[PDB]
């Protein structure tokens, strides 16, 4: 058994975290009571990775639900599977965060952190072999962005030798109006670059655009968006959850995916939103990327591809070889055999064949450039600095988080320009 420990934080965090468990519970054969009503035993073989086994053969997610406002909390139990969770693993503020990063990181979040850290430990010490953690949150406002990165700091301090995997949801002015988001994100990324091993960028700008153009949704809801995220998140964990050729775990992912510690921000992808070549074409298509970045504008350091369904893997092998040949200038040449693939026989609910695509592309600097720009439009103005310097923060701290995120893009460019000869 290799136990991941899940942590949802904030408004965005808990919601995308919730449909996550709804989906993987359905794939694995678990109803909202925690019992297994499933056909195949391939759904149990590695169930302990996300699930505590309770006698009465009840499987309990290994989830720590967290927020600074009890509202988001109540929704969870009320919703489907709300009663599969552990009642103790809810940890709730009262005063809330009010879309302020300082309130999540330094002040009000500080007051609730040690109450989370305690549930972490209780869950961590129950583990035969703790992989680490995945945090579902947002970088746009309040609890998930700030307390989530303060919780990261604190956890890494107690588990410096465990993996820290986050699903961070990046702000898009096409989906939220609160103007302090370019601030919240940049201060989070300053922390994410320094204290996570793997961060999947879920870009609300790319989730919107997808829903609006491909899915043609004239007004997409945070529920139509989160339908995309649940598909992605079931995908980028297939090899954690199901038996396969490769004994995937959160560190083997990191070792093989992250050639430089800081360059650990993955562009996810899904298809379809079919044949093995259409999948592959779409899966490498910038229209299927969950981060508003075009791969053809940079170069792939490393790529992972999950094929789900019943399909000729001989076909898959030739198809994946085909895209690297025809697209060869878009994979850095100084890292051989840097595109791996895995196939799992069970596809997600309602798709006979899916593909999921994790990429580490220097084009992610696009994502970070858009945030960097909206930042400086406010920071050049000194706008709303009072929401932050009032909570005790220095102005130097905005400068630093800004220079750091600028370096991160500068380093992506360094290796996009790098050659072998």
């Amino acid at each position: 058994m290799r136990e991941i420990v899940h942590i949802q934080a904030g408004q965005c965090g808990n919601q995308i975290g919730a449909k996550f468990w709804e989906v993987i519970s359905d794939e694995h054969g678990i109803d909202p009571t925690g019992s297994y009503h499933g056909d195949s035993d391939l759904q149990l073989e590695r169930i302990n990775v996300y699930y505590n086994e309770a006698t009465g053969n009840k499987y309990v997610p290994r989830a720590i639900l967290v927020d600074l406002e009890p509202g988001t909390m109540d929704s969870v139990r009320s919703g489907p599977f709300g009663q599969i969770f552990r009642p103790d693993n809810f940890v709730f503020g009262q005063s809330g965060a009010g879309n302020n990063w300082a309130k999540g990181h330094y002040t009000e979040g500080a007051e609730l952190v040690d109450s989370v850290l305690d549930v972490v430990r209780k869950e961590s010490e129950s583990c035969d072999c703790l992989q680490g953690f995945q945090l579902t949150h947002s970088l746009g406002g309040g609890t998930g962005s700030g307390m989530g990165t303060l919780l990261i700091s604190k956890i890494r301090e107690e588990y410096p030798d465990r993996i820290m995997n986050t699903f961070s949801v990046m702000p898009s002015p096409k989906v939220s109006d609160t103007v302090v988001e370019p601030y919240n994100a940049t201060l989070s990324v300053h922390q994410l670059v320094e204290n996570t091993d793997e961060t999947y960028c879920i870009d609300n700008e790319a989730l919107y655009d997808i829903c609006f153009r491909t899915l043609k949704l004239t007004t997409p809801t945070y529920g139509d968006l989160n339908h995309l995220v649940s598909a992605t998140m079931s995908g980028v964990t297939t090899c954690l959850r199901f038996p396969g050729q490769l004994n995937a775990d959160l560190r083997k992912l990191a070792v093989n995916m992250v050639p430089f510690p800081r360059l650990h921000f993955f562009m996810p992808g899904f298809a379809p939103l079919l044949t093995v070549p259409e999948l592959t074409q779409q899966m490498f298509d910038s229209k299927n990327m969950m981060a508003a970045c075009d791969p053809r504008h940079g170069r792939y350091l490393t790529v992972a591809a999950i094929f789900r369904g019943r399909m000729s893997m001989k076909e898959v092998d030739e198809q994946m070889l085909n895209v690297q040949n025809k697209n060869s200038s878009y994979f850095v040449e100084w890292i051989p055999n840097n595109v791996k693939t895995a196939v799992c026989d069970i596809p997600p609910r309602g798709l006979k064949m899916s593909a999921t695509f994790i990429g580490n592309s220097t084009a992610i600097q696009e994502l970070f450039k858009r945030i960097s720009e909206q930042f400086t439009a406010m920071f050049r103005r000194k706008a709303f600095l009072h929401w932050y310097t009032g909570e005790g923060m220095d102005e130097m701290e905005f400068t630093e988080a800004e220079s750091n995120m600028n370096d991160l893009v500068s380093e992506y460019q360094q290796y996009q320009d790098a050659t072998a000869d």
Binding site: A102, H105, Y106, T107, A110, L150, S153, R156, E157, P160, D161, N195, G390, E391, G392, M393, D394
Partner: protein, 68 residues
């Protein structure tokens, strides 16, 4: 003379089988020791900066108490 030689050759084969077990044993212990210090030195660096982060969260909270 020939027997003096015969015993010198078997003394050499022993000398060298031994020096080889020796230098292996030592090369190992050197490596295993330089590795504990390196890995520790690295884990220590990580904590020292994770805690200097906690000191900065004191300074930050103590500034908002200089607001009231």
């Amino acid at each position: 003379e020939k027997r003096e030689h015969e015993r010198e050759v078997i003394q050499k084969a022993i000398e060298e089988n031994n020096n080889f077990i020796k230098m292996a044993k030592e090369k190992l212990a050197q490596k295993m020791e330089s590795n504990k210090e390196n890995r520790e030195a690295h884990l220590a660096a990580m904590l020292e900066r994770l805690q200097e982060k906690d000191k900065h969260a004191e300074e930050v909270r103590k500034n908002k108490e200089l607001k009231e």
